[PDB]
Amino acid sequence: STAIVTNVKHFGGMGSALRLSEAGHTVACHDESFKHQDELEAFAETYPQLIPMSEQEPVELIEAVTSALGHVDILVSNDIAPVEWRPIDKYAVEDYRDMVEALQIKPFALANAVASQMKRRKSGHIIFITSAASFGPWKELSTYASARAGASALANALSKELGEHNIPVFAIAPNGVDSGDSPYYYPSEPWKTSPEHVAWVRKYTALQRLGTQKELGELVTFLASGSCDYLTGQVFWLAGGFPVVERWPG
């Protein structure tokens, strides 16, 4: 069994690849930084069980993994883009195009690249990592929320067509997952260190903590296990019960 996780250094990347590798999958990894062979090799060294690739675009990635490692059983589309808050009238339209490009066109492209081999084999699992920002409670986050909702809906729609070919499709919509060193999207600092941030988490999440990479990994790996294919089409709101607002005052 062979899996690909994109953007492996950020967001859901490491939790997914590490937990998948432990489950006995051969895991190919993608990252922008794997353009430079310095970076690739420093990552191959640190992580001898993972298999990082130079390939950058969806179709050359799928073919490169398919050449080397067999045939893709699992796609984890771990999509990232900078959120910077701003009012609608300030954004340029070309900004929304880039947002949709990173968060929405990308997973479609990866699914579209892998789908016909999975269908031929009548097996595969496809998992988009999106965000709980979809129809979420934020303001001035509009380009981001909407592109993520695009990607979740794409997952749910694909499930309906690929079910016939025995391929479950899932979206994982996180909030408050500790991203460690990565800025996408809850780096240990300021989130574990700054008392103002720590107070925000305890205020608005039900479990009053950040989620761990390992939780995000365990979920990815359960979905990819073949244990619960019948959940196909589910968007999983991995957000520790966010949002939680307080009772009326006084």
| Cβ within 8 Å of residue 170, ≥6 positions away | 125, 126, 127, 128, 155, 159, 223, 231, 232, 233, 234, 235, 236
State yes or no: residue 233 binds a copy of itself (CB under 8 A).
yes
For the segment 161-190, give every residue that binds a copy of itself (CB under 8 A): 161-164, 166, 168, 176-177, 190
State yes or no: residue 37 binds a copy of itself (CB under 8 A).
no
**Which region, judged by CB under 8 A, interacts with a copy of itself, from 6-14, 23-31, 74-82, 145-153?**
145-153
Neighbours of 65 (CB within 10 A): 25
For the segment 53-92, give every residue that binds Cl ion (CB under 5 A): 82-83
Least Å distance, CB 42 to a copy of itself, is 30
State yes or no: residue 232 binds a copy of itself (CB under 8 A).
yes
For the segment 177-206, give every residue that binds Cl ion (CB under 5 A): 177, 185
Least Å distance, CB 39 to a copy of itself, is 27
Quick one: which of 147, 182, 184, 224 contacts a copy of itself (CB under 8 A)?
A: 147
Give the distance between the most distant pair of CA atoms in the chain: 65
State yes or no: residue 237 binds Cl ion (CB under 5 A).
no
State yes or no: residue 174 binds Cl ion (CB under 5 A).
yes
Quick one: which of 53, 115, 127, 224 contacts a copy of itself (CB under 8 A)?
A: 115
Alpha helices in 75-180 (DSSP H): 93-100, 106-121, 142-162
State yes or no: residue 141 binds a copy of itself (CB under 8 A).
yes
C-beta separation of 18 from 180 below 8 A: no
User: What is the C-alpha to C-alpha distance for residues 110 and 52, in angstroms, rounded to an integer?
Assistant: 17
Interaction partner, residue 47 (Cl ion, a copy of itself, none; CB < 5-8 Å by kind):
none
Quick one: which of 61, 74, 145, 224 contacts a copy of itself (CB under 8 A)?
A: 145
C-beta separation of 43 from 34 below 8 A: yes
* Residue pointed to by tokens 């496809």: 126
State yes or no: residue 129 binds a copy of itself (CB under 8 A).
no
Neighbours of 32 (CB within 10 A): 14
Comparing CB distances to a copy of itself, the nearer of 42 and 59 is 59
* Residue pointed to by tokens 């695009």: 150
The closest alpha carbon to 175, from 220, 139, 145, 218, belongs to 145
The closest alpha carbon to 159, from 111, 105, 216, belongs to 111
State yes or no: residue 87 binds a copy of itself (CB under 8 A).
yes
Comparing CB distances to Cl ion, the nearer of 21 and 179 is 179
Least Å distance, CB 104 to a copy of itself, is 7
**DSSP 8-state class, residue 9:** T
- The site for Cl ion (CB under 5 A) is made up of 82-83, 174-175, 177, 185
